[PDB]
Design a protein around this ligand. Structure first.
Ligand SMILES: C[C@H](N)C(=O)Nc1cc(C(F)(F)F)n[nH]1
Lengths: 412, 412
């Protein structure tokens, strides 16, 4: 048998806000966090906008000196992680520190730092590279710095599954607890890829929306005029906790994590199969893992990236899995508002799925002005929809055909 | 309930050879794979040598058309993966492809490609960034491309835990199989960090040996004249398989994976604690996972990086875990010959540990002329030691205080 896993703490930086409740208030108001990117010359670039974190103050978390050692994606991951641990109320002690671990990941990691050190190297040679270049840029340093700061001695690792990272991180941390390898895990992801290399790299693949004139309308999942994803920054962290451990200390429980699915498309490096066969297998695996019938699902937080092929693949996958129930559930893309946080997408979207359960409301897909051919599901166009939600899924489908699905259920 | 996991296939690129047998022949012969680096001009750098893969032919494995899109760390990881799958004898079918996954990780990933594209961006503009920059550089694309080429539809992910990556990848892939999430996993790691930013960044930390005038003697684990690690390139991959699945198809079984441990030091971003407390916690976790008496351990493939603090921490940890038995087991660092393959170190060293079991021989720690204060175990100085090996342990320790231990034993 397996132990039950609940969510007792959440933390976030997003284009909508510097914490969970501010972000969530924006989500339910249909607000966009997308704007032209500042303090960066994007003249030569085909995309000049994205989802930036606005007004982040790292000195609320770290000394200026410890912050100078760390790439922005690590700063953002630590901010979300500290928020989540605070929100959980957990007290770390010599009696439990070997049972508390971390799995905070990233899709792309320390591009900003790599960029800034390339500048030093090309202009002046290697002797100007920062001594902290390597430890301050590598993806496992959110887990690393968090464990050092809070004295966590439990499983310490980091996933990097591109746009699926935050979903896999949470799911695998839930397995650690379910199978008795930990009692508490801090899990999620962070990303800051708004650099020449990120906007330039995705731009060279022509993967991004180029709707420079109306950035807030760029991210329009399932709309017939969508023209690719919107690049966004931030972080999400959850405190996962074994149920008896949470009840023993009187934790506030937001929701239960009942299912995790993984699959590989084995199809293409960047594009999903048109029928979303891999996304369907992954959702079916997550529902089997939860012991739930597709008919019990009420709300899906889609991957919903605003790419032509990805959005239509998800509709096909949901129709395949859910059959006569596919129209009864609500499915929305919060990427319509936040843009695509890449490795942090699944982390912030797990939090939005948990809050959909808490508040009994489906967040909107904004900009869904003209649903495309066959996009005839309840996609919660334009405005939040209060409804019964007992079971919420969150899907991530990333480069390499790597899929993840989380299943959350109301706890009582 | 938890299933047993065996090793049925192995694959490798190392500084000693373009496959497993050639690498292992070098290991048992005490041969060094370390030499001045030829692929770039390092005259401005404090370290100008390392463990390169010599004469790698990507067209043994991939079309030159596909190879051109991929960073060397991806090409190396695919080469080792393909070798391991071929060595396993496994045939991928519609009946089993959903039950076969992949977890190939990296510590740093596509730093050469990112550097080269940063040079394009800075010198020429964003329009000269490769369209393949993201899928050809990000760490999950070994798992991704391997799944696409072989049709693996099982769990598809990647770890990035710095110098612990290969050990974590193999251990977690074993748990996937143990817990029923997959019947087969291809797991390991790959690394090619020998670019300006890699050698420059580890050089800026003063972490690397600077023995430029005698590179084969630079890597000298536990030697009083050691002065840091040697940077090395390559890949290890193993096919892990559920025992009854292997038995049912008449697989050749090299060894059984009986134990996996993780722990966090929670001490320092880069420095190991002198007392090796986290490494000891990790080994004890792994031995308890394997249901072993510590006296059963015959051979330890150490992390053995040739750093002052790391090498002595490992002696302290082994003495703390094994007590008087610390004097009966054999422990060696194959990094004395291969150098430090970073995220691939744990993968090649797991293969060396399995071959120690197959051949009943402890590989040497070459260059151990003058063991340092307290370094008074059997460290297999200079020459391979034939001996009884029923149980072999492979340790890895990384930045962020992240520790992993694998326990292998003979299978009859
Ligand atoms: C004393 C040390 N500077 C520290 O920050 N402790 C700390 C932070 C947190 C939380 F909840 F934010 F994660 N708990 N405990």
């Amino acid at each position: 048998s397996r132990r039950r896993v609940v969510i007792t703490g959440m933390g976030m930086l997003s284009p909508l806000g510097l914490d969970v409740p501010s972000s969530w208030e924006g989500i339910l108001a249909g607000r966009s966090g997308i704007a032209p990117i500042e303090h960066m010359d994007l003249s030569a670039y085909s995309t000049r906008f994205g989802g930036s974190v606005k007004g982040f103050n790292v000195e609320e978390y770290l000394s200026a000196k410890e912050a100078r050692k760390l790439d922005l994606f690590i700063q953002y991951g630590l901010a979300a992680s500290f928020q989540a641990v605070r929100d959980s109320g957990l007290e770390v002690t010599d009696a439990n520190r070997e049972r508390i671990g971390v799995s905070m990941g990233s899709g792309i990691g320390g591009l900003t730092n790599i960029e800034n050190n390339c500048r030093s190297l090309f202009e002046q040679g290697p002797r100007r590279i920062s001594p902290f270049f390597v430890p301050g840029s590598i993806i496992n340093m959110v887990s690393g710095f968090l464990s050092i700061h809070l004295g966590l001695q439990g499983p310490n690792y980091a996933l990097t599954t591109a746009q699926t990272t935050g979903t896999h991180s949470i799911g695998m941390a839930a397995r650690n607890i379910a199978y008795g390898e930990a009692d508490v895990m801090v899990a999620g992801g962070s990303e800051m890829a708004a650099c020449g290399l990120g906007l330039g790299g995705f731009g060279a693949a022509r993967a991004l929306s180029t709707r420079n004139d109306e950035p807030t309308r760029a991210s329009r999942p399932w709309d017939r005029d969508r023209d690719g994803f919107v690049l966004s920054d931030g972080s999400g962290a959850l405190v996962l906790e074994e149920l008896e451990h949470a009840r023993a200390r009187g934790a506030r429980i937001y929701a239960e994590l009942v299912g995790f699915g993984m699959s590989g498309d084995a199809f293409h490096m960047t594009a999903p199969p048109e029928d979303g066969a891999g996304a369907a297998r992954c959702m079916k695996n997550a529902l089997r893992d939860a012991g739930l019938d597709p008919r019990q699902v009420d709300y899906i937080n889609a991957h919903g990236t605003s790419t032509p092929a990805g959005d239509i693949a998800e509709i096909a996958a949901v129709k395949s899995v859910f059959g006569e129930h596919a129209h009864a559930l609500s499915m929305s893309s919060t990427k319509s508002m936040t843009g695509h946080l890449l490795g942090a997408a699944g982390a912030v979207e797990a939090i939005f799925s948990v809050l959909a359960l808490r508040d009994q409301v489906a967040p909107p897909t904004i900009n869904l002005d003209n649903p495309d051919e066959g996009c005839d599901l309840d996609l919660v166009a334009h405005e939040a929809k209060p409804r019964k939600i007992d079971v919420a899924l969150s899907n991530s489908f990333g480069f390499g055909g790597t899929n993840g699905t989380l299943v959350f259920r109301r706890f009582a």
